Amino acid sequence: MDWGRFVEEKVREIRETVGDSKAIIALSGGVDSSTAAVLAHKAIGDRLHAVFVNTGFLRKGEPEFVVKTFRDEFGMNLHYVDAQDRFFSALKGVTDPEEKRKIIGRVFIEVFEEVAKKIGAEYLIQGTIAPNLKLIEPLRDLYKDEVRELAKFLGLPEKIYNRMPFPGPGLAVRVIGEVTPEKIRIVREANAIVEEEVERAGLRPWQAFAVLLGVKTVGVQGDIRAYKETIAVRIVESIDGMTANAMNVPWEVLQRIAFRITSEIPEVGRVLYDITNKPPATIEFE
Amino acid sequence: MDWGRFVEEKVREIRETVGDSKAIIALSGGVDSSTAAVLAHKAIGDRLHAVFVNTGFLRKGEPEFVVKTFRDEFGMNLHYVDAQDRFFSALKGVTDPEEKRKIIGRVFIEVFEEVAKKIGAEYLIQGTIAPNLKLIEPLRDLYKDEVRELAKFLGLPEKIYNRMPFPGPGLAVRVIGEVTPEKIRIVREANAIVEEEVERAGLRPWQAFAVLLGVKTVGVQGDIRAYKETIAVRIVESIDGMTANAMNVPWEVLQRIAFRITSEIPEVGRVLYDITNKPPATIEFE
């Protein structure tokens, strides 16, 4: 596409809508929010306030990477909000996955509203794609492939424009049952091993992640009465997320994953690989 | 080695020890007790009382097979004992794996003692191998591989002398947490599917089974969403159990297993394959 002309017009559009007001955008690290943020930034520079909320449920290294990218490389106003305590407290004892999602959504809005008020913004930029504050949706006519192309054109890093999707509730829906700091810590480390080994093996799945199942087991070494955690590895191929298949991952890759998780995360005693397609199963476990 | 001589000698030894009294043996379906039973039967005929206890945790078709083999084809003096209510009732509310095993052991002894008292035998036959009632252990000098040879020589079916080992507590240790009739029914059907697919593909693992994890997932049943269960598939290769590797099962076989479980057992919505070796893990989950 004529991206140069697309950018030009869009930046112009945003400039004309915002004028001399402040706008705000929530950054997740996702390709959509990232692409929208760069467009708005090209439009209004220092009057754009990017907000990154550390929920405590993000992937290993994500907070650092988002800051480095948006603050350091792109030179945006980036409000880093450490909300980990707030989110962990809000989820304490919650086992129903629908309630986890509902509460995380609620708490995000609280924290984000709190920041927006201090900024005095007039406009909200959102990364909505095809399918208070006035709404600007610069990516509204674009599909996922087109957004990825634009992100590339705008100079966003490959880590972002090629990224596998990561849910709003983050690692909280990758822990079966009540979320705690320790359970998130374990699943975060397991997730990172999965992503590392998937990348190493040149696998290009739709999604690849770890889930802490809650089931416990004793092993055959050391304290053989100590119950250890169980991780499920979920790796799927899909065009859209609508139908998906469990990936036929080479055996040595699964072995590396199982070995690394049990060796490097001593709290985990068992590793299982999801072999279920969608349908009948969801991609996420919760 | 000389099995004809071994049998002639052992039979004589049993005849000489027991004389005109009765002996009793607990039949598990396992190669050791099966072999010891056939020898004792050769020795003393109907004065051998073979007790087979249906714990309620046996595999699909196993009780029928044990009865057919020992009562119908061998002509043994078999006591078929249905003790299901006793075992399930005893396990009400119990989730701790060690407690489950302890209770099952206790109940078995209770059941066996009750039957033995009515039989009034003077000798207990056991299938102990190398390395009240007077004990006879006709296999005491034999190693595991030798017992299998002997079982074949005595005309025991291949389904016994080449059987994968199966725990005394049976499917009860293949249900995470409280053992209930429904959970046993589900895992029984899943186990059958796993063994059937292993057989279909001509695989010869050390053990191949299913475990009901107790982890719920959101599936569809007809026109509505429904919480469904999660099965773990455990298939291992091993010399003698000392260590074991998660088997590199052909993807097509894993897919048949996942497909059949979720299609034929609609209570199950997700299937996971254990990729953990021993060490660090145990083979069973409980």
Swiss-Prot record, chains A, B:
- Return the Pfam families for the record: GMP_synt_C, NAD_synthase
Q: Which domain of life is it from?
A: Archaea
Q: Per its database record, what is this protein's job?
A: Catalyzes the synthesis of GMP from XMP.
Protein name (database record): GMP synthase [glutamine-hydrolyzing] subunit B
Q: Which residues form the GMPS ATP-PPase domain?
A: 1-163
Keyword terms of this UniProt record: ATP-binding, GMP biosynthesis, Ligase, Nucleotide-binding, Purine biosynthesis
Give me the residues that bind ATP, please. Answer: 28-34
Question: Which InterPro entries does the annotation name?
Answer: GMP_synth_C, GMP_synthase_B, GMPS_ATP_PPase_dom, NAD/GMP_synthase, Rossmann-like_a/b/a_fold
Alphabetically, the GO molecular function entries are: ATP binding; GMP synthase activity
Q: What EC number(s) does the entry state?
A: 6.3.5.2
Q: In which pathway does it act?
A: Purine metabolism; GMP biosynthesis; GMP from XMP (L-Gln route): step 1/1
One GO cellular component assignment for this chain's record is: cytosol
Provide the catalytic activity annotation.
Answer: XMP + L-glutamine + ATP + H2O = GMP + L-glutamate + AMP + diphosphate + 2 H(+)
**Subunit structure, per the record?**
Heterodimer composed of a glutamine amidotransferase subunit (A) and a GMP-binding subunit (B).
In terms of NCBIfam families, this protein maps to: guaA_Cterm, PRK00074.1
Organism per entry: Pyrococcus horikoshii (strain ATCC 700860 / DSM 12428 / JCM 9974 / NBRC 100139 / OT-3)
The record's annotation in PROSITE patterns points to: GMPS_ATP_PPASE
